Amino acid sequence: VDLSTTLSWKSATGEAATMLDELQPNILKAHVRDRLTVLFLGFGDAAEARTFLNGLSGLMKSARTHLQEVEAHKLTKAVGTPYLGVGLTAHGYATLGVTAPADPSFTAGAKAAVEKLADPAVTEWEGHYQQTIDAVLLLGDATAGPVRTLRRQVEALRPASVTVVGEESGLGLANANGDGIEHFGYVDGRSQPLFLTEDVDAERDTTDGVNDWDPSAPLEQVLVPDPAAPDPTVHFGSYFVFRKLEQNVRLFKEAERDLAHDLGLRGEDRERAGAMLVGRFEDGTPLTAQSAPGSHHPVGNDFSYDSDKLGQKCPFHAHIRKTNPRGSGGAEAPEEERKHLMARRGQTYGRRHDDPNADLPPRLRPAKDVGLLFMAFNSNLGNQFEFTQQIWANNPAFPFPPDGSQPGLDPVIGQGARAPQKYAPEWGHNNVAEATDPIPQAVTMKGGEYFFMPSLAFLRSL
Template sequence: MPLKLNNFDPHDPTKVIPLDPDAPQHAAMMDDLQGNILKGHGRHHTAHIFIKFGKDPTQARKWVKKISETVTTAFNQRKIALARRKALDSGENWKETTFRGFVLSAKGYQALGFKNDQIPSDPKFRKGMKASGQDLNDRPSQEWERPYRDEIHAMIILAHKNEAILKVESRELRDDIENTKGALKEIATEEGRVLPLDKNGNIVEHFGYVDGRSQPLFLQEDIESEKKKEGIDQYDPSTPLSSVLIEDPNGGKESQSYGSYFVFRKLEQNVKGFKDAEARLAEVLKLKDEEAERAGALVVGRFEDGTPITLQKSDGMDVPAFNNFNYHKDRNGSKCPLQGHIRKINPREQSQEERGHRIARRGITYGKRREDMGDRPEDGVGLLFMCFQADIANQFERLQQMANATSGGLDPIIGQKGDKKIPLQQQWPCEWAGENRNTQPFDFQGFVTLKGGEYFFAPSISFLKSLG
């Protein structure tokens, strides 16, 4: 029986019937699906090895087939995670494992000898990220870092808890690529590393804010755990599979082979510029001392510790990085401005249509900081932004376009104007929930720069194994 991707409850179309990984049909699908799609791999160090295939597709295919033996399936990712938790809970030793993933660009399919009609059909994927530059107000690709100006055919992700082990495995794999004598070559390797966790054990990004909290959930057990933690009655993260999976056109197992489109963007963060602008915004809004924290929270939509600004005027909510909220009691944006990053790209309306725009974010920070994060680099650090989805135009590109939309003000973190001359639109509330809607204009933008990227597809395991 084919998997029901549009898995809304027929009796209550506002609810999703999530995936039960123990059900045989779902387990079989997860055994042919790559990990990291339905749920993040959770390791704190990553290597992203970008590859270009040579002129001989036969050699390249053989190599990909060999690699496919090491790719982590969604089924195994879960099995390992459950065994790890059990071992750690009962005080047993646990040997950490490496996560491996493999994604192909449309040019990569072609270089492996696939014809256009055999390549996954998303038009945005087939054309590649550079072709979307105008639609996204991206910097011209001639200004990207050199390796990204070139054609990229594939990327391998390695991830491990331990940086030293990861480095050895990454070196071995890159040596192996070199030994293929031109059948493929490494064109760049990016290293992701999670920054020191905050006091509540949460992951933060370089501007200092908790990140990765709000995610679409697909597995029954993840939704159950969210229900227990803080409820899902104000914001339901359960999301249909049709937002993240498509049937792999080249899959080897009928009705069981799925894949997902994968967006990669290297986004550099100017930490000094951002922090200085936060301080200037606080001055403009006359927010002093402890209240000054609110300036940054207006920009992000959450305080640094993750407290949503639409719920309270200062940080420190009991449950860190609370996610069961919406903006129904803040329609005019007097608590969280409409342009605040998390509000601009997720108004939390929860209709079937809105859930269809969600992306499974799987990014990781890159670049080194001082141990205490007291430094404020202007370049060399940022986010390796990554996300999975079923439709690039309707999901990643739509979100980036919402961020770029000037009505209500540009998204102050990721909004891009391109070379368009756009008058200042952002208005910032001076008081939290102030009744007179007293606002001040302030231009907050330009601290995130695109350094390069590409659109990929994470194919089914049976497809990878069929190469060669």
């Protein structure tokens, strides 16, 4: 298996083909999960846990079967089957007495990452995230029905010594254009690393294109040999970040309002204040390409910041620019910068009674108990999720503006002390203004953990 480039899944042979037969879904290509049940488990007895996992492997489809289902849906509107994802924590490997993946963030666990990420202390996390977690189960589908069915089958197999220490439910949100959004109202999950050549072709043929931004990512950017598997040369897994992030929509919308007022913004153009925080409008037109919304036919991703090196269109500290400078970061060569990028597979949680894109005042938005079940696959947690959160988002110095100044923290997910930032009131011009206050932190980490999704052959071998 060649991990140095993308893979053409349809014409893969030999080991690469085997790898696909033994890989879980949702990794090389996201699985539909508009209804998602998340189950965190505790292992009371090692032998019983191994038996449980073995039975789970029986309910699991491979990456390749999933891909076929995807192709079938496009071709013939076929529905496909549910997603059963299985991850193990370092502690869960210890309970099983099995050789574990060696990523040091994985080994230490998310509770140990609290200091370097500037996370709230573990004592401030929700109760179930304070407990020792051995495993996560992901049950996902387009609709609630088959999730209920799958849950019953999982239950059937579950022994009493495998406890459920916690559960979450994901509910996908969409706008009128049919694009998925997060609670602040913005199209989310547009920009993804593409590991499959067929996905890169699709992106080229059916979106704005891939002329300016190449979304390709080598297999090594997500896949890891499964160390305890019968044959790590063909049996692969991936590291998995789960973090429950609460969104105070109310405060975020007040923040949009106050920044607009601060910058003298007027009329509908007041919406651009929000775009400055995120890097896209709600719809989400890239702020680096347009001063206003409307480019969602379809939502584009074919852009870089090479004509925006001064940040006068999209500010340096906008969320997507902080988290993917697209070669403009200034700290390392573009070819190395992009190695920190990762596959995001999150799902929103919570129910609300307001259309997230409706024209409503901030007071009518929820302030808690909705948000994002942030999820991602990494081949190297320290160099991908943690790098992005710590070295980019939380870092006041990054990315490097040509004038050598510090743009400050990512306003959407930045953690730690914040200060007022600078913005360009006039799109594409050199006028600069310093807000009267820092953007308030409207996202709160409620608890999370690190896992590894092992190969199917490993799970069967237990």
